[PDB]
Design an enzyme around this catalytic site. Structure first.
Site, PDB file in Angstrom:
ATOM      1  N   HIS A   1     -36.711  29.990 -43.559  1.00  0.00           N
ATOM      2  CA  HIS A   1     -36.283  31.089 -42.755  1.00  0.00           C
ATOM      3  C   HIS A   1     -35.189  32.668 -44.417  1.00  0.00           C
ATOM      4  O   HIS A   1     -35.244  33.736 -43.498  1.00  0.00           O
ATOM      5  CB  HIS A   1     -34.876  31.560 -41.830  1.00  0.00           C
TER       6      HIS A   1
ATOM      7  N   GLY B   1     -24.909  34.269 -44.861  1.00  0.00           N
ATOM      8  CA  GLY B   1     -25.424  34.166 -46.836  1.00  0.00           C
ATOM      9  C   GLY B   1     -24.844  32.874 -47.330  1.00  0.00           C
ATOM     10  O   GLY B   1     -25.951  32.372 -48.594  1.00  0.00           O
TER      11      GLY B   1
ATOM     12  N   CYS C   1     -26.505  29.888 -45.959  1.00  0.00           N
ATOM     13  CA  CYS C   1     -27.939  28.857 -45.516  1.00  0.00           C
ATOM     14  C   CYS C   1     -27.843  28.631 -47.775  1.00  0.00           C
ATOM     15  O   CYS C   1     -28.474  29.333 -48.114  1.00  0.00           O
ATOM     16  CB  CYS C   1     -28.143  29.681 -45.547  1.00  0.00           C
TER      17      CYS C   1
HETATM   18  C1  LIG Z   1     -25.185  34.873 -39.483  1.00  0.00           C
HETATM   19  N1  LIG Z   1     -24.130  33.963 -39.909  1.00  0.00           N
HETATM   20  C2  LIG Z   1     -22.929  33.318 -39.288  1.00  0.00           C
HETATM   21  N2  LIG Z   1     -21.969  32.757 -39.375  1.00  0.00           N
HETATM   22  C3  LIG Z   1     -23.023  31.999 -40.177  1.00  0.00           C
HETATM   23  C4  LIG Z   1     -23.140  30.393 -40.430  1.00  0.00           C
HETATM   24  N3  LIG Z   1     -24.479  30.141 -40.622  1.00  0.00           N
HETATM   25  C5  LIG Z   1     -24.914  30.955 -40.651  1.00  0.00           C
HETATM   26  C6  LIG Z   1     -25.711  31.802 -40.190  1.00  0.00           C
HETATM   27  N4  LIG Z   1     -26.905  32.547 -40.175  1.00  0.00           N
HETATM   28  C7  LIG Z   1     -28.052  32.163 -38.542  1.00  0.00           C
HETATM   29  O1  LIG Z   1     -26.995  31.618 -38.586  1.00  0.00           O
HETATM   30  C8  LIG Z   1     -29.065  33.160 -38.606  1.00  0.00           C
HETATM   31  C9  LIG Z   1     -28.254  34.267 -38.486  1.00  0.00           C
HETATM   32  C10 LIG Z   1     -29.403  34.706 -36.859  1.00  0.00           C
HETATM   33  O2  LIG Z   1     -30.138  33.473 -36.523  1.00  0.00           O
HETATM   34  C11 LIG Z   1     -30.850  32.062 -37.121  1.00  0.00           C
HETATM   35  C12 LIG Z   1     -31.614  31.507 -36.416  1.00  0.00           C
HETATM   36  C13 LIG Z   1     -32.013  30.409 -37.224  1.00  0.00           C
HETATM   37  C14 LIG Z   1     -32.025  29.938 -38.567  1.00  0.00           C
HETATM   38 CL1  LIG Z   1     -32.037  28.981 -39.323  1.00  0.00          CL
HETATM   39  C15 LIG Z   1     -30.809  30.621 -38.559  1.00  0.00           C
HETATM   40  C16 LIG Z   1     -30.307  32.028 -38.317  1.00  0.00           C
HETATM   41  C17 LIG Z   1     -24.385  32.740 -40.713  1.00  0.00           C
END
Ligand SMILES: Cn1cnc2cncc(NC(=O)[C@@H]3CCOc4ccc(Cl)cc43)c21
Ligand SMILES: Cn1cnc2cncc(NC(=O)[C@@H]3CCOc4ccc(Cl)cc43)c21
Ligand SMILES: [Cl-]
Ligand SMILES: [Cl-]
EC number: 3.4.19.12
Lengths: 304, 304
Positions: free
Chosen positions: A41, A143, A145
């Protein structure tokens, strides 16, 4: 003595962290040999996340669209491929700090350390477990990920997790280093609810043995139980069923403390039925399940 | 989201760990520049520990009696001196992995990470706090002495603790990197009982703000209190008195969540008086006090 939620030393994994940027998305990557592993992603915008066709989005990206930065120097991307939900970015330089490593897919109940990172920079290290519903209860922000979960066997780092997503309920989902998600989760911004988060019974038993080893013995009772009898109570408390394999796994802790595995099961059975009564075990008011029997032996013997 | 007992990345400190052996005693040492810091009791036998005259025992030791081993290569000791309860062994080689560093003496309530070591080898990393009775509740075994506690400010490692001793009650005692013990403890195998282990109120408040930030809001009530009123309840529960300095320290967390500091104090006051009622906060059945207000902000913002 003393028993703490201990993570593995992170230095070997800190030397592998890089920043991966594709367009306007920046996440973390794991640099091992001449390959940088990161969540696929990285190629999406926040709008593409709603319904991404990754194979199609990837057609529009070339080697030069992936900006890989180790420390403060840029790495040259000479190839890119998608393996399941991860991208493998082949760089022209092999990571000089690459430790001895393996890619392992763990079972639920297994524990690992996580080195949380932002922009390729480590911010902290903590221990967590693969839940029976295949989620992890981590600490990750936007951030983070690409941050990885791992175990160390002396000098070999076994990478078992890459962080990808946060479900609406605050729990976390990710993949192994081959791109295969743990559980049923998909890298799509869609309603995905986790199943029942059961308690890892074998881990609680191992932690009760660590408590006896470190001098907390108040919960020890005059009773014993059977696997069938304990599992009736365990089911009722959303505890995982205990098997003869789990009993065998606990064998060494049982030998060390002289407390039979089924006697400890009866101690746990009474704690489930009566509660702690305002008491604590190893500084905890709840039954901890994120220490495997191997973690207890390792911490109590001081394996380096 | 998610809030974990997170330790700092340990790599910078792993590159400083060495093994120090004097006679039949082997513990850990911290190698910074051309100096190796270790507990002075490395010069004692288990019998000398009962009543050691360190200045006298040290007369019998020369530079060659201190065997310092970094990885698997020996360091040449060209000088030795005792500073309070630590030995400083001057070696002929400056540690090439020496990070930017400081020696700081911390106040009770302050948190730090510990890299537990055995024979100069890191076994694990965990977070703990300097208790109000000047002990720490670590996880240390025989041979872990010389393991250090630290904080990182981007690239500067502030060393605040060296492990020395385990009191009969399983709690831990040690010194700062100048050899001065935290609290009244002495490096003698004699009955030393710790005082009251009070709860670090400011830290519990910071952790309640982290819970609201991460979506656990059930404990929030419709009440407010004053510093004097809250401190009457806090005294009764062996909680440290809360000061205007602690309120000021919580200012930014109060701004982030819109919950006034004294309103959160009233929430805590009701949790103390009513208990959790079988409920949890950030996965805990007890009020956690080993996260400072700075740790909450750092983890919730992702400082690297
Ligand atoms: C946005 N965010 C906030 N705290 C996070 C902690 N870990 C991860 C994330 N990020 C996500 O989950 C993004 C945001 C959009 O939705 C998706 C959908 C699929 C996948 Cl693989 C990633 C994501 C976090
Ligand atoms: C023996 N031991 C076991 N688990 C330990 C964890 N941390 C430390 C120790 N070691 C000690 O406390 C030794 C044992 C003899 O008594 C004294 C007296 C003073 C001092 Cl400074 C050190 C010691 C441990
Ligand atoms: Cl989602
Ligand atoms: Cl003692």
């Amino acid at each position: 003595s003393g028993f703490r939620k201990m993570a593995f030393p992170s230095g070997k994994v800190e030397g592998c962290m890089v920043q991966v940027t594709c367009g306007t998305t920046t996440l973390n990557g794991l640099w091992l040999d001449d390959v940088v592993y990161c969540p696929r992603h990285v190629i999406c915008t926040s709008e593409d996340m709603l319904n991404p066709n990754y194979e199609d989005l990837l057609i529009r990206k070339s080697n030069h669209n992936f900006l890989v930065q180790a420390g403060n120097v840029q790495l040259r991307v000479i190839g890119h491929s998608m393996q399941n939900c991860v991208l493998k970015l082949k760089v022209d330089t092999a990571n000089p700090k690459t430790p001895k490593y393996k890619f392992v897919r763990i079972q639920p109940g297994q524990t690992f350390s996580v080195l949380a990172c932002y922009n390729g920079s480590p911010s902290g290290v903590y221990q967590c477990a693969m839940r029976p519903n295949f989620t992890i209860k981590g600490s990750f922000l936007n951030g983070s990920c690409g941050s990885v979960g791992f175990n160390i066997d002396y000098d070999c780092v076994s990478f078992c997790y890459m962080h990808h997503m946060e479900l609406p309920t605050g729990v976390h989902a990710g993949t192994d280093l081959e791109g295969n998600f743990y559980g049923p989760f998909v890298d799509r911004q869609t309603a995905q609810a986790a199943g029942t988060d059961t308690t890892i019974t074998v881990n609680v038993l191992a932690w009760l043995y660590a408590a006896v080893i470190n001098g907390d013995r108040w919960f020890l009772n005059r009773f014993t139980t059977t696997l069938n009898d304990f599992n009736l109570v365990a089911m009722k408390y959303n505890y995982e069923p205990l098997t003869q394999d789990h009993v065998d796994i606990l064998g060494p802790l049982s030998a060390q403390t002289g407390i039979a595995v089924l006697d400890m099961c009866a101690s746990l059975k009474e704690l489930l039925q009566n509660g702690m009564n305002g008491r604590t075990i190893l500084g905890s008011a709840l039954l901890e399940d994120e220490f495997t029997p191997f973690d207890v032996v390792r911490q109590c013997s001081g394996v380096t």
